[PDB]
Scaffold this active site. Structure first.
Site, short mmCIF file in Angstrom:
data_model
loop_
_atom_site.label_atom_id
_atom_site.label_comp_id
_atom_site.label_asym_id
_atom_site.label_seq_id
_atom_site.Cartn_x
_atom_site.Cartn_y
_atom_site.Cartn_z
N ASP B 25 0.78 -1.23 0.00
CA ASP B 25 0.00 0.00 0.00
C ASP B 25 0.82 1.29 0.00
O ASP B 25 1.26 1.75 1.05
CB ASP B 25 -0.92 -0.05 1.22
CG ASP B 25 -2.01 1.00 1.20
OD1 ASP B 25 -2.04 1.83 0.28
OD2 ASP B 25 -2.84 1.00 2.13
N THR B 26 0.99 1.89 -1.18
CA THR B 26 1.74 3.15 -1.30
C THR B 26 1.01 4.32 -0.64
O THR B 26 1.59 5.38 -0.41
CB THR B 26 2.01 3.52 -2.78
OG1 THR B 26 0.78 3.57 -3.50
CG2 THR B 26 2.94 2.51 -3.43
N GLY B 27 -0.28 4.13 -0.36
CA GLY B 27 -1.07 5.16 0.30
C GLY B 27 -1.07 5.00 1.81
O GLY B 27 -1.82 5.67 2.52
C1 LIG Z 1 -7.56 7.46 2.86
C2 LIG Z 1 -6.29 7.44 3.67
C3 LIG Z 1 -5.05 7.31 2.79
C4 LIG Z 1 -5.06 6.02 1.99
C5 LIG Z 1 -5.21 4.77 2.84
C6 LIG Z 1 -5.51 3.55 1.99
N1 LIG Z 1 -5.64 2.42 2.67
C7 LIG Z 1 -6.04 1.18 2.01
C8 LIG Z 1 -5.89 -0.01 2.97
C9 LIG Z 1 -6.55 -1.33 2.52
C10 LIG Z 1 -7.91 -1.54 3.18
C11 LIG Z 1 -7.80 -1.62 4.70
C12 LIG Z 1 -7.53 1.44 1.74
O1 LIG Z 1 -8.20 2.07 2.56
N2 LIG Z 1 -8.03 1.02 0.59
C13 LIG Z 1 -9.43 1.23 0.27
C14 LIG Z 1 -9.63 2.58 -0.45
C15 LIG Z 1 -11.06 2.89 -0.91
C16 LIG Z 1 -11.39 2.28 -2.27
N3 LIG Z 1 -12.67 2.05 -2.53
O2 LIG Z 1 -10.49 2.02 -3.07
C17 LIG Z 1 -9.95 0.08 -0.57
O3 LIG Z 1 -9.25 -0.43 -1.46
N4 LIG Z 1 -11.15 -0.38 -0.25
C18 LIG Z 1 -11.77 -1.47 -0.97
C19 LIG Z 1 -11.96 -2.67 -0.04
C20 LIG Z 1 -10.67 -3.38 0.31
C21 LIG Z 1 -10.97 -4.62 1.12
N5 LIG Z 1 -9.86 -5.57 1.10
C22 LIG Z 1 -9.90 -6.77 1.67
N6 LIG Z 1 -11.00 -7.16 2.31
N7 LIG Z 1 -8.84 -7.56 1.62
C23 LIG Z 1 -13.12 -1.05 -1.52
N8 LIG Z 1 -13.43 -1.44 -2.66
O4 LIG Z 1 -13.85 -0.32 -0.82
N9 LIG Z 1 -4.17 4.73 3.85
C24 LIG Z 1 -4.48 4.44 5.11
O5 LIG Z 1 -5.63 4.11 5.44
C25 LIG Z 1 -3.34 4.48 6.11
N10 LIG Z 1 -3.22 5.78 6.77
C26 LIG Z 1 -2.18 6.58 6.55
O6 LIG Z 1 -1.32 6.37 5.69
C27 LIG Z 1 -2.15 7.88 7.35
N11 LIG Z 1 -3.46 8.52 7.35
C28 LIG Z 1 -3.76 9.48 6.47
C29 LIG Z 1 -5.18 10.00 6.61
O7 LIG Z 1 -2.96 9.92 5.63
C30 LIG Z 1 -1.59 7.60 8.80
C31 LIG Z 1 -1.12 8.89 9.43
O8 LIG Z 1 -2.60 7.04 9.64
C32 LIG Z 1 -3.53 3.37 7.16
C33 LIG Z 1 -3.32 1.99 6.54
C34 LIG Z 1 -2.56 3.60 8.33
C35 LIG Z 1 -1.10 3.64 7.96
#
Ligand SMILES: CCCC[C@@H](CN[C@@H](CCCC)C(=O)N[C@@H](CCC(N)=O)C(=O)N[C@@H](CCCNC(N)=[NH2+])C(N)=O)NC(=O)[C@@H](NC(=O)[C@@H](NC(C)=O)[C@@H](C)O)[C@@H](C)CC
Lengths: 99, 99
Positions: B25-27
């Site tokens: 996760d680059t994000g």
């Molecule tokens: C929005 C905040 C920045 C991007 C985010 C992306 N995280 C991935 C993690 C993987 C899921 C837990 C994510 O949320 N992906 C979502 C993004 C929304 C989207 N629709 O693309 C996703 O792919 N969600 C899928 C579901 C994935 C389920 N996967 C699984 N069950 N294996 C979806 N379709 O809804 N990063 C974060 O959530 C990270 N946060 C951070 O990097 C920092 N926070 C901020 C706000 O910058 C830090 C200071 O906390 C977390 C991991 C802590 C280090």
């Protein structure tokens, strides 16, 4: 370009004629942008993250520039902490993760 | 390797002697792993993203094996729905975004 990850991979994007900063996110399936006005109709979508689920507005075939590369596809609009460019659009700009 | 983004960039890691599937996760600033035991002292931390925040335990100087590489750094442990490999460790294996 080649972007290292010592800093957040933030790029400039252009959507709706506006310039915004977005995070290139390999951990995101979709592209989610902060609240803004987009043309046309939207459909509901539920997305999940680290803290849980949120409801967003799904707009299809939206023209968006990502770091100078034009993409046309789905953009989700909602209460996201940061604008994120997901895999759906990263694939359109030819982005790969390498090591 | 060069990883395309047509599907979620998943990798197998070895942490605490345990094999786990994780998302590149680059994000993500930090590496966040599902509940597990890690040696040494820790400190509480709140991390956020889509859906809000979750409270995790921060362990420093934890060695993780990823793609043959043996990296070391901070690992956060908590109720995360997906094991996430963040920038803190991706930099160590020399991962970059290219397009
Ligand atoms: C929005 C905040 C920045 C991007 C985010 C992306 N995280 C991935 C993690 C993987 C899921 C837990 C994510 O949320 N992906 C979502 C993004 C929304 C989207 N629709 O693309 C996703 O792919 N969600 C899928 C579901 C994935 C389920 N996967 C699984 N069950 N294996 C979806 N379709 O809804 N990063 C974060 O959530 C990270 N946060 C951070 O990097 C920092 N926070 C901020 C706000 O910058 C830090 C200071 O906390 C977390 C991991 C802590 C280090």
């Amino acid at each position: 370009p080649q972007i290292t990850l010592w800093k957040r991979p933030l790029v400039t994007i252009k959507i709706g004629g506006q310039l915004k900063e977005a995070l290139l996110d390999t951990g995101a399936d979709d592209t989610v942008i902060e609240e803004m006005s987009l043309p046309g109709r939207w459909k509901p979508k539920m997305i999940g993250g680290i803290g849980g689920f949120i409801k967003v507005r799904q707009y299809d075939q939206i023209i968006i520039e990502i770091a100078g590369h034009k993409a046309i596809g789905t953009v989700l609009v909602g209460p996201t902490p940061v604008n994120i460019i997901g895999r759906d659009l990263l694939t359109q700009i030819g982005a790969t993760l390498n090591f």
